[PDB]
Symmetry: D2
Subunit: 314 residues, 4 copies
C-alpha cells in the first residue's frame, strides 16, 4: 500500500485550513477528520470533498473515529479550547495539556505507529507532552516550531528587498513570542547575508532589522485584530512539514526538535532548523549564532521551561 493517510484531529479554523491547503497542493491521498463535535467534522469533510473533481489530486476525505489512526502515516493535532471566563492563562494551558494527552492516548490505543505533527498551542509544550504520553522516540513527534514565524520573517524581508520569499534564507529560533530570536546573523538572500546588505552594501540599516523583527513578533496581533484569528499562514506551514515527511525530502525546516546540547540547551522541544524525513526529525542544525542571539535563545528556552514544569508529567 503506497497510499498516504493523514489524520487531522480538530476541525476548527486551523485543522480545516491545513486540510484545504493539503488538498489544493495534493499532498496526501487520504484525509480523515476527527473532532469531538462529530457533526462539524462531518460538515467539513463534506465541503472539503465536494470540489475534488476540479482538483489536481484525487484525495479521499471523510469524518471518522480514532480507529482510523491504526494505519495512518501521520497524525496532525490541532484540537483545543478557548479562553474561558474564570480561568487564568495557565489554567488554559493545563486544559489543552489535558486534552492533548487524552487524544494522544486514544490514538496510540488504535495501534497507530506513524508520525505526530503537533500544531495546537502552545506547540513546544504540547509537543513535549505528546512525546511523554506517546512513549515514541522524540524524532517522531514533530511540532510546528517556528515555521510560521520563519515564513513571516521571510515575507517581511522579501517585501523590504522586493524579492521572492522563497529566495530568502534565514530563521526565527526558539519559542514563538516576545523572546523569539530573529537570527539575522544566519539569514541570506542570494548568498548575501543580511549583515552584508547592511555593513557593506548599505541597503538596510540596523533599525530596519529591528522593525522587521518586531513585525514578525507582532504578526499574530495585527491579523487577529483585523480578522479574529490566524490560520492560513499556519495551514501552509503545517502542510510544508507534512510534505517533507511523507516524501522523505531530508529538507531543513525550523520545526520543534528535541534538543540534546545544541544551541547550549537540552531536554525540550523548541524551534530550530532541522533535517526532516520519513522518520520525523533526523538531526538539528546547530547554528553558531552571535552571543546576543544566543543569550536571547537561552532566555526564550528559560521561559519555555518555567511553564513546561507547571504542567509536565513525571
Amino acid at each position: 500500500k503506497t497510499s498516504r493517510k493523514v489524520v487531522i484531529v480538530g476541525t476548527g479554523f486551523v485543522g480545516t485550513s491545513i486540510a484545504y491547503a493539503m488538498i489544493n497542493q495534493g499532498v496526501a491521498n487520504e484525509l480523515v477528520l476527527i473532532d469531538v463535535n462529530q457533526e462539524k467534522a462531518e460538515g467539513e469533510a463534506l465541503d472539503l470533498l465536494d470540489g475534488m473533481a476540479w482538483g489536481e489530486k484525487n484525495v479521499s476525505v471523510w469524518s471518522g473515529t480514532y480507529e482510523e489512526c491504526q494505519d495512518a502515516n501521520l497524525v496532525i493535532l490541532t484540537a483545543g479550547v478557548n479562553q474561558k471566563p474564570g480561568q487564568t492563562r495557565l489554567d488554559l494551558v493545563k486544559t489543552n495539556a489535558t486534552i492533548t494527552r487524552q487524544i494522544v492516548k486514544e490514538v496510540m490505543a488504535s495501534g497507530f505507529d506513524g508520525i505526530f505533527v503537533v500544531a495546537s498551542n502552545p506547540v513546544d509544550i504540547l509537543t513535549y507532552l505528546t512525546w511523554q504520553e506517546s512513549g515514541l522516540p522524540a524524532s517522531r513527534v514533530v511540532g510546528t516550531g517556528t515555521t510560521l514565524d520563519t515564513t513571516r520573517f521571510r515575507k517581511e524581508i522579501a517585501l523590504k528587498l522586493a524579492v521572492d520569499p522563497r529566495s530568502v534564507h534565514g530563521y526565527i529560533l526558539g519559542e514563538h513570542g516576545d523572546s523569539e530570536v530573529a537570527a539575522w546573523s544566519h539569514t541570506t538572500v542570494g548568498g548575501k547575508p543580511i549583515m552584508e546588505y547592511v555593513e557593506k552594501d548599505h541597503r538596510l540599516e540596523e533599525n530596519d532589522l529591528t522593525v522587521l523583527a518586531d513585525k514578525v513578533k507582532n504578526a499574530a496581533y495585527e491579523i487577529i485584530d483585523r480578522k479574529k484569528a490566524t490560520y492560513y499562514g499556519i495551514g501552509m506551514s503545517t502542510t510544508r512539514i507534512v510534505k517533507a515527511i511523507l516524501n522523505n525530502e531530508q529538507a531543513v525546516l525550523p520545526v520543534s526538535a528535541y534538543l540534546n546540547g545544541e544551541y547550549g540547551e537540552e531536554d525540550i522541544f523548541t524551534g530550530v532548523p532541522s533535517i526532516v524525513d520519513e522518520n520525523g526529525v533526523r538531526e538539528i542544525i546547530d547554528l553558531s549564532i552571535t552571543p546576543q542571539e544566543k543569550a536571547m535563545f537561552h532566555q526564550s528556552v528559560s521561559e519555555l521551561k518555567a511553564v513546561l514544569d507547571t504542567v509536565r508529567l513525571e
Copy 2:
C-alpha cells in the same frame, strides 16, 4: 507584462477560500483583495501572504482599492449579504443585486477591461446584472453556473462506483436548486454511459439515480446544517474556472453562459457545458438531452426568468 493579476471583491468565507485555493494551486501571480470592510481585507491579505515562503508558487497578495482593477486580468465577485431572519428571499436578491451593480460600476470606472467571474448568489441573476451594468460582451462575464453542483454530482457517482471523481464525466444543468437538471443521459464513466450501467450491466438501478441526484440537490443544506455554511467546494470550482481562462485552455466547464437558442432557451445566463478560454466563454455545447431532462431545464430557466424580471436593469 506576463504577470497574471486577479482581483477578488468580497473577503468572506467564499472570497478567502478562493484566494487560498488559488495560492495553494499556484494560480495567478497577483491577488488583490477588496472589501467594504477594509480592515477585514487587510487581515486576510496579511494572513494569506504569511505562508508564501512555504508555497509552491510566488503569489503577491494585498488589500486595495478599485483602482487596482484597471490593469487586472479578471475580477471575481463574491460580495453580498446573506439571508437574515428579518427579510424576504426576494429582498435578499434585491440587496445583493444592488451591491453587485454598485461594485461593477466602480470596477468599470477604474478602467478595467478584462473578464468577470461571478461567484456570488444568486449567480445566474447576478451574472446577468453584471453583464447589463458592465456593457461588456456576454462572453466576458462568466458565472460559476453549475460547476459546484457538477463536482458534487461527480463526487456522489465516484463514491457509488468507487472510482476517481475526475474519471466521471457528466453535468448538472440549469440553475442550482430543486430545479437543476441531472443530465444522466449524457453522463459516462470510463466511456460507459450511465444508462448502460443501468440497462445492460444492471449495476445501477433507476432509483439510485434519483437518490444521487437528490443528494446533489440537498448538498448545501446537509453542509450548512453542520458548519453554518459552505465555501470549500466553491473555492475549488471558481479556481478551476479562473485557471481555464488565464491559460486559454479551451476546456469544457458548466459555467453561467449566455444562451442564444441552445437548449431551446434565450436571453438568459445559466449552467451548461461551455468552452472556456482567455476571452471568456467561446461557445456552448448543446447536449441532445432527453425530452424529460429538457422539460426540467425549461422549468429551471422559467423560474430564473421570473425572478430576474423583477431585477433586470432594462
Copy 3:
C-alpha cells in the same frame, strides 16, 4: 516507510524519457536506473539528477543492480533490442520476449513484491510473458496498452474541435496496430457523443472519423520518419499509469488488462479502459461498443493470440 521507489529497466529513449517526465512531474521519490549497458545507466542517472535543485520535487536518482527491486514499489520495463539484419520481424519479438523474460527473472530473484508496468513492444505480448514468468496475479502486471494511442486519439479530436485534450473522453481499444479499434461509439466531448456531433450538430462528418482514426494508426510512422523514433508520448503515458498506481487513484486508463469474457474475449492482456489503483488493475470496464467496433476488436485479439502462441511460455 512512505518513500515511493520506482525502478526503470532499460535506459534508452523511452526509459529516460519516462524518468524525465517523472522527475518534472514529481511522481516518485526514488528513481533507480538499470541497464545492461552499465556506463549508459550511470551517465543517464548523472544527467537526470543534475537539475534536481531547480525541480519542484526532491527525487533521488541513481543507477543500480536488481537488488534495488527488493523494496521497489513499481518496476517499469522498457528494455529490448533493435532489428538485426538477416533476422525475421518475428525473430525479434522472440528475442525481446526472452530479454524481458530474463529481466523479470532477475527482478523476482531480488525479492520484488510490487507492481510491474510493461512499456516495451509488443506491449500486450511482453505483458503476458511478464505475467507468466513473474508468477504474479494478472492484476499486478500492468501493460501500457493503448494509453498512447488513446492520448493521440484525444489530441487529433482536440485539434479538430479546438478543445482541451483533457476535455476529450474516448478510447482506442485492443492491440496497437492496423487492427486497433477507434471506439467512436463511446467518445465524448463536453458530454456530447461524437455521433451527436456528426448526426445532429453536423460539426463533423463520417469521413472525418475515418481520417482521424488513421492519423492515430499512422502516428508512429509519421513521427519516426521525422525524428527516427518516438518517446515523449509514451514517456507521458507511462508516467500517468505510474501516477495512478502509487496514488491509488481508482482512475480509468486503457492499460493492458487480463480479459475474462469482457468484450467477448479471454485469456490475453489487451488495451481496454480499466480501473487502476495501488494494487494494479482492479477491474475492466466492458463497453457495449457497436458490432462493427466489436468485430474489429475480435480481429485485433485474434492476431494477438496468433503471435502470442509463438512465444508464450507453457505455464504461468
Copy 4:
C-alpha cells in the same frame, strides 16, 4: 491575451529536453518549435504534443517559422553545432556565433519584442552577441550562466551531507569551466555556512571542498563520457529561468547578467546571482567574496573577454 507563448529555436537534445521539461512542469501555454531542419522540428512537435491528454497542463505545441516570434513572450536559443575532426574550439565558437547571429536577426525581423533566453554554448559569449545583434536592453537577454553548474554544485553538497538539494544555497560564479568559481564563502545549508561546517563543526575538511568543486568542474566530461552528451540538467535549469521570468518571480538565479562594476568587472555577461522578473534581469547581487574567489573570478572573466573579442561585433 494571458496565454504565454515560448519559441524554442533548435530542436536537438537540448531544445527538446527543455520543451519536455516545460510541458511536464506545466510552464507556458504555447510552445513553438523552430529548426533549420524543418522535418525534425515537425517530428518533435508531433511526439511532444501526443501525450498532452495525460499531462498536468494543456500545452499547445507546433513547428513553425520565425513569424511566430512576432507575438511571442520569450524566445529560447539552443541552436548550434558540435566539434568535428580537426576543428579548433575557436572554429566551433565562430560558427555557432554566426548561426546565433543569423537566428537573432530573423527573430527581430519578425517583430519580436520580448525576452531572449540563451542556452546555446558558449552561453556567455553568445548571450553577448545576442545582445549586440538584437539592440534590446542588456536586461532582456538572459543567458543560462551558471545555473547548471550551480544545481550540480548543490547536488554534490546534498549528496555529501544527505540533505534536500533545494536546501543548499550557494553558487558557481563566472563562466563555466576550469575558471568557474565555487563560492564556498557564501554557501549555506540550513542557514549554516559551509565554512562553519569546516572550521567549527569540522564535519567538512578543506580537501572535501576541493573534490566537490572539481566533481562539478568535470561534471560534463563525466556525462559525455558515458552518454555522448548532456541535456537533462540544462533542460531543467532553463525551465527554471523561464518560469521565473513569466511569473515575474523576482527570484535569484545565477543567469548570464551584464556586469557593470559588480565583482570588479564590466561590459560582459557572466554568471552571477541576479534577480529575475517578467522584464528579465533586474539586478545583480554583488557578493563580497574572498580575494581568492575574486581572483579566480577575475581569471574567469578575463579568459571570456579574450575569446569574445574574436567574434565580438
